[model samples]
Target chain A: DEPPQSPWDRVKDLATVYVDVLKDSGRDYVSQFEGSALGKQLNLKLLDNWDSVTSTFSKLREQLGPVTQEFWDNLEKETEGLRQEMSKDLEEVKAKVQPYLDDFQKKWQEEMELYRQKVEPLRAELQEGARQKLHELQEKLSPLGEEMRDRARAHVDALRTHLAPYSDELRQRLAARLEALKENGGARLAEYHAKATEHLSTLSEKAKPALEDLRQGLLPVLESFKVSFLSALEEYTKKLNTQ
Target chain B: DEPPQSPWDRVKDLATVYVDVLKDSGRDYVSQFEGSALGKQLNLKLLDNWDSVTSTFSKLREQLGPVTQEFWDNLEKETEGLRQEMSKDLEEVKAKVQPYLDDFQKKWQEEMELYRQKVEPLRAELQEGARQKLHELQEKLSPLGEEMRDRARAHVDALRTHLAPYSDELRQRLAARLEALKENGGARLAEYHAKATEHLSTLSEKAKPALEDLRQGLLPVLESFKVSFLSALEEYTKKLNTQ
Candidate 1:
């Protein structure tokens, strides 16, 4: 539709067409991921595990619907479902990681430190990934019809799971950047980088231990859910067999 | 040519044909993996990572041959290369797991624990996987011509890396089996599996921490080698530029 002539009509046409393009591509909002230069920095290492499982599992999820309540209802601590459990554990891990990211950001600016400007795109990638991921989780959680406490769990799990690979990617750069700093400034600088890395690395907590802690937290959490999922499948299979 | 003899000669005829079959397929000694029932439970979650890397890496390794000595030789700690560093770390992690296995074995026997018969094939798979993996490592290491301390590292790395996925498989069974025991025997028996699992889990040390620690040990080693490899490639590129 053509608009009536006005001082802003030219601006209106440009905005309208761009909005339409975004409406068509759900993926467009996060095109910073597809932003060719940004991905040359780094991108998601997730969805591979979750999306594939979800696809094959959609049929099973339907079959599973009737049984999960009975099987999971007695789940001992009122903690609710598996996804929530992973979320809380991840929150704690995030709490632990924030100070380090803050610390690293503080230290890096001290260096600016050349060959370092590229770090800006990486920083942009991770921040936007978080921003975009949060937006997507809302869209995902909307239809479930749950309380805030309950609603937030799946949101938490996906957040940290996505956060972790980025953190790991973040870490490789952290080390590489520090090395570049160390060599440029000589041995004194090398010592500073080591101490600074260690500071960032309590429990050697770069991305790795954080990654592992995230992984470790998931295990007992995994057992509970795996137990739930397997038990459901077993019970469902049993019920089907009975019929 | 053909000849005939006596009763001993007939036995020789049977043995010779079997040996010829064995000679043809290196994969045959471990056909138990290919044995129908076992893989129905689980099989290698490896080769997906390594063999693919090795395939692409072979071309690189040929290119890499001239440069490695320069790139790697300054290595401190006399730890040698990446594979060795990985090996020793795995050994310590393996040492940690042994008692857990011994503990789990003792606990399980106390339970034959129906559905426990299945554990036997898994045990066989792990043991033979160990045996077969070691044999492969020997062939891999044979051409390196190194000392015992130096030679053993790669052997140790492959041994435990293979050990780990199987151990992870082992733990899942451990947990599942324990649940079966707990439910079947009631709460009094439930106490036993918990205590037994804890004892087996000194660091909560089933397969996972061991796996994680193996992974943890790998990172610094990975960084060191990664630096070396990247440095070599960078240096090589520079040399090519000069040429």
Candidate 2:
């Protein structure tokens, strides 16, 4: 009494006093102590009754205890009512929106299928159109190329034809000059030979080279034109098969 | 006028008689028409009695006009019931499948985004890493190239240096021999000169071309080596930088 007890004794005594309080107050002791300084100090607010605590502490302890339970007997009925109300509301919403959604889906699927149906034909048509246009352009252009090649050949042929008439005249002149040189062999043979050599040189220099060039450049062009014309005809016939 | 009633009138009178029989019997008078020959001839097999046949026939014209409307209305009611039941089933299915679809879509989008994100970076990193590795390889091989160049340069310098003293000594010996021959020239000078000239011709033939090649070919080779080395270095450097 005069002096304070040791720490262990104090702890044991405090426990005994709390047990006595629980014994006296029955099940409501914890609730009664809730929010009190003692409750805060001991963390005692969660225990709803002392029967559980005392039963755990001592099985032979005889005491009447208060009962505690939540009052929720009508929960099922209330939940059922709530479910019906929700169902009704949901059905109203479904009524308002379902037709539009179904119609929209049906129409969207129809239109998308229609688009899919058309795309292949349209793509084929576009490619065929481009190919047809290209063929038509080729048809229009082929004649022009042939005309140009024919014109080039005709020009070279004209040159050959005109040049052919002069060859006999040139030969006759050469024969007359040779005869004159023979007649003047002692007097003017050297001069006549020089003049003849000069004339031959001029002919070779100016005319032979041009004629050779005509032969080199034109003959190949005519041959190539013939091959190309035949090839173009073959191609034209092949394109016609596409129809 | 004395002839028996026409078949049509007889049929009508029989229909009336059949109606009277049905009225007398316990059965409804209208139901008799269902079993009548006239009803079979008219192809009205479904009617159950005489009065029903008459009533249905009178109403059939109007009913036929609106039959589709009634059928559609009933079909709509049945469809609505089916739809409600189906909606419930669909809700369960949606609840089951929505999460999976959402998850799959999310994962697909994530994977696509992640793959897209890495494509450019991966190529960039690979190209840059290859460049770095190539640079490392270049660094490793650089000393070998430098060593080769130095060897070539040193060998050329040594050859040129050693060749100088030998060339000078040979040139001096040749000059001394020629001088000596000049002094020995008199009555025997032509023969002496000719012998000396013959030896000179041989010596000149051997020495002149060899010395000229050293100057032309060796110096050019050295110059070309420098150009090649520099050009290779510049090219590798540009390639590395571009990478």
Candidate 3:
């Protein structure tokens, strides 16, 4: 009642308080996750995927909860369950937008590399085809003199006229292929980003506010828990400083 | 009942008589999962927490009763023990990871942006401080230029006099503080990454291998399930294509 007469009195015979603070907070945070919705989610990821990044998030989430929960509790000079829910909702908002950004970033870099390779082959084919045709006409026209030159010109004109018919078709096909490639590669990134942003909006606008209200309504007990933890942390810190 | 039906005939009926086949095979798969050490090891991630994951693994080691022994009779291949465990594990993994990846990716980007901002201010401050100090030192020495410069040319004499007693303490203290700021910021990133990677390793190396063996080992069963379904599908397709 008198704030315990000494540091020993405050936490009598507790040899290690600071480390205990960190460890206890960690355990408490983990308990909130146990068998909960978030807990199940992490378990699935850790257990299910071909590659696991499951434990990384689990650990970080567990560790940060105490700090993050503290931040929310401190806001508005008085803590409320609504405030706590808002903090979690904010976290959910961040969670929803990030994956799309990373996926787009990866795909975009890959597409640029692929585009470089694609264009190089296209350029060589276009140039070699053009040169080959020119060389063939020269070789055919080379033998005849002015007679051959006039005839060659006529032949060239005929060839050009014949080629014109296919040129439009070839151009159209090329255009279609290019458009398809661009659409397939380019628009997917845009779509990924859009979907990601849409998710963020849903989290912020629809999910956050609604989730906060629902969580607040359902868990009035959170307020007491918040106060208990905050007071516990402050008292612990003060005890450490005095020692 | 009569002479033995051919294995192929049994296999064919396995397709047509799907319900009976599923009932038998499903029971087998569930028994394998419940009875086998490997199957128990595979389900660690979908459980509650580290304690749950650990206890379940110990149970597997001790050859404890089936986790779902109470619900065994009521559960079937389409809806029961091993199948439900597989489905639930898959769902939980997807749910846990997808959102966390999304959130972590977003937070990382924000942290990068914040770091960039901090760097700009820090760089400017460091550069400006260095430049200002140098300029002031140069101005002070400039007025005493030629005499000092002549004396400076004799570095042994100058070092014995002016440079020897210069404010080494002030300069060293300032340099130490500046370097410390950069070191601490860099350390923070290194620390975060090290911890994050450690967490990821446990998920991937320890947890994922168990889960994969469970899933991959069951591939024959999934394939069998698919073949059964495909046969049913083909029957429907044949009826539809009758015209």
lDDT of 2 by residue, B1-243 (tens): 113455343333323443443344433323333333332223233334544445445654553464434434444544565666676667756765655565466556655664455455547645754654465456546544544454444322223245354553332233333543454454256545654775576467665465553344344334434533442223221111111
- The CAPRI quality class of candidate 3 comes to incorrect
Q: Return whichever of 1 and 2 wins on TM-score.
A: 2
| Model 1 chain B lowest lDDT segment of ten | B234-243
For residues A1-243, what per-residue lDDT tens digits would candidate 2 score against the true structure?
Answer: 223233332433344334443444433433433323232213342343344456544532231111114223424565566788776766446555544554465555544565556556535654655664455446645443655465464444423333345432222223233443354453344544654564445433222222223332333334434433222221346455632
Query: What digit string (tens of lDDT, one per residue) describes model 3 on residues A126-242?
Result: 466556455434553433243445544444342334424553233222323344435444645565575556444443332222222343232223333333323222134545552
**Per-prediction backbone clash count:** 1, 6, 5
Evaluate model 1 with DockQ and give the value.
Answer: 0.00
lDDT of 1 by residue, A112-156 (tens): 542244445434554655664454346545332333344354334
* Error of model 2, residue A179, in angstroms: 99
Which regions of candidate 3 deviate over 4 angstroms? A1-243, B1-91, B99-102, B136-243
Pairs clashing in candidate 3?
A41-B96, A44-B92, A44-B93, A45-B93, A95-B103
Candidate 1, residue B86: the lDDT equals 72
The sequence of per-residue lDDT tens digits that candidate 3 reaches over residues B73-143 is 33343244455467666875676566556546655665555446545754665575465446545654545
